[PDB]
Amino acid sequence: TQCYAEITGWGKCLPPATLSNHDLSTFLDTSDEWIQSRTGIEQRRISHVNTSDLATVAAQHAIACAGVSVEEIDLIIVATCSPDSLIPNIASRVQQNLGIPSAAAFDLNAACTGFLYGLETATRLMQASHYRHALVIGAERLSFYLDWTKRDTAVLFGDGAGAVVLSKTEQKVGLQDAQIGCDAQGRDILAVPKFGTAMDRFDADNGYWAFDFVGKEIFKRAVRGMGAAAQQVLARSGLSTEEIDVVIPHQANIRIIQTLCDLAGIAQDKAFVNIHRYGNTSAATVPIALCEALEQGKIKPHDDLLVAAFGAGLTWGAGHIRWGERITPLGKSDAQLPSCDHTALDLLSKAIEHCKRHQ
Amino acid sequence: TQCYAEITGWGKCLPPATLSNHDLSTFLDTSDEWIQSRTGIEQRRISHVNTSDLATVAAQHAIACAGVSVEEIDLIIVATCSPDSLIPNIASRVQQNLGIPSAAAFDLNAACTGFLYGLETATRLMQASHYRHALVIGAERLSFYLDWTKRDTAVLFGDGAGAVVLSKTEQKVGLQDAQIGCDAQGRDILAVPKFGTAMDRFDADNGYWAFDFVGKEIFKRAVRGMGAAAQQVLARSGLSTEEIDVVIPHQANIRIIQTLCDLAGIAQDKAFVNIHRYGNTSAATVPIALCEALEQGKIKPHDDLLVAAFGAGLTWGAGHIRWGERITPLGKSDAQLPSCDHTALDLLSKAIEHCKRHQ
Ligand code: NA
Ligand code: NA
């Protein structure tokens, strides 16, 4: 008997400390004019807490939004490439924080495509086996990684988390067809090769790692990768392009999003965009954007959503989500991060000082 | 129409440098007598290459064993908690090394239960969607993490990789029912909290991290977790315990494996054990053990396998695999690691010196 994973809960956690384009302009040869025109980004958030904490708050909001009890959750996937720790995983920390008993809990790493990978994986696990409710979270603290002397990457990335709760049903809703993949031959153009077990653990300079980033090749391959994936999704599902009501894309560059819509013949005003506020938050982009699309009344019952993402790997993906009946939360959560009496510059102060002094 | 993921290929990669119990005895207050009697471990392997390289060789062997071409692989999961890098993932590095086009590729972290999680995930992905062949790899270089002044953990862990290839079929083979989970309340008893984004990136002492490990509580919870999971698997499948032909367990302690069989009423001689040779290789234990069980003629066509694992999280799992017709490789691979003209003590020399000098 055919089953589905309906998205019944959504939630986000953006940390409060805000790094503006002008803030970056004080310690870097860049400008608000260049950044906003090339990328669309105006602000990003910088976390004063760990990735697991951002993930926990978003999940709390999603659970309240779904009206599910913690004892109903059977599966927790955290999509991240910036986990607090590797032993143990941070899906288990989120589980511990929420008091969810027994659920399967793992971290998934597919970089910026991680939430799509996670939604796909959770959806298939639910359809093929005995998982009735899932929590899928994209959460990142990319500020940990940045080279504060390197303008090419330092202005692109932010911190945050988004979550969904999935509920098993016989109604034809949630993620339908999905096409995810990886173009591995281009792996080297977007990489931090020396954070991980490849790094020299006892070298005192091991913190001063390179963030390889070939913006132009990334731009080109992302358009092509997402584009092809979206076409496969639309083709297999028998949908005309006008039947897509909303695009929820990965938020890496506004011009990538525009080019994607243009080449697919999707009207620009169907794309939800919040990159101006948050920047590229990797695995978090899609579920935050989905959460806010719902908050802002952009999605209607029964809408067809196109999701699309791309990332280091080079990972890629697209998916068709058919929304159900409810675009309103069942409940609200007063869950919050601890207060932060610091600016974004204050938080990055030490890291910036070290990066400049080492150069 | 009901589909299955048959295990058609298996492979392993053990690095050649061998750390004996006596080797550990020279720089640590421990002995071969204590280690072998408490844990069963006599030797472990210490890698001279990165995790991705171990994963690549095992995958190569598995592909040759399955007789599949690299263009047929649709999905690559690497289970690891010791990846070379976080950006990008190492599933993509394995993909790049093998020349596999387009496949979905992600890293999964559920610590020592990672391979079970990965097998489950790949199997459900294949059953519910359009993935025809998968590569699932457990790969670890745990020697990166160890505190060479701490005997409690330094003698338990080794390096290695194991892989399987899965092929979609209508025959009722491969992983059948599976029960995976996580008991998150005991998360703090097995942890390296300060490797990851929680660590101070610019502290020169950030390499001297604690490896928290409460052996006794871990022992007790592992028996109970795996035991309960195995019972659920057996119960749901309508199998009597005598119908299990082989147990392929996680290899963390021989006494855990024995207790598991004892309490389930499974005969001890059905458990495949190689912990004496390799130690605890985390996500790699199960697929290396499976690979060697097949190499050594322990598995017959149509056998029922019980798999069980446990790990940091505390993650846990069990699964029933029904084997198919073939226990022999279709082909062999001459794929090898680069030669290593060093001992295990030679390789660890620098790390050991730093750990001792810092104390
Ligand atoms: Na429609
Ligand atoms: Na049998």
UniProtKB/Swiss-Prot annotation, chains A, B:
Record bears the keyword Transferase: yes
Molecular function terms, GO-annotated: 3-oxoacyl-[acyl-carrier-protein] synthase activity; beta-ketoacyl-acyl-carrier-protein synthase III activity
- Catalytic site: 112, 250, 280
Query: Transferase: is it a keyword of this entry?
Result: yes
Q: Where in the cell is it found?
A: Cytoplasm
Quickly give the catalysed reaction: malonyl-[ACP] + acetyl-CoA + H(+) = 3-oxobutanoyl-[ACP] + CO2 + CoA
Q: Which Gene3D superfamilies match?
A: 3.40.47.10
User: What are the annotated disulfide bridges?
Assistant: none
Kindly name one Pfam family recorded for this protein.
ACP_syn_III_C
Pathway this chain belongs to = Lipid metabolism; fatty acid biosynthesis
Instruction: Give the record's GO biological process terms.
Output: fatty acid biosynthetic process
What cellular-component terms does GO give this entry? cytoplasm
* UniProt-listed InterPro entries: ACP_syn_III_C, ACP_syn_III_N, FabH, Thiolase-like
Q: What is its EC number?
A: 2.3.1.180
* Major localization listed first in the record, in broad terms: cytoplasm
Q: How does it assemble?
A: Homodimer.
What does the record say about domains? Answer: The last Arg residue of the ACP-binding site is essential for the weak association between ACP/AcpP and FabH.
The similarity comment for this entry is: Belongs to the thiolase-like superfamily. FabH family.
What is the protein's name according to its record?
Beta-ketoacyl-[acyl-carrier-protein] synthase III 2
Species this chain originates from: Vibrio cholerae serotype O1 (strain ATCC 39315 / El Tor Inaba N16961)
Q: Which gene encodes it?
A: fabH2
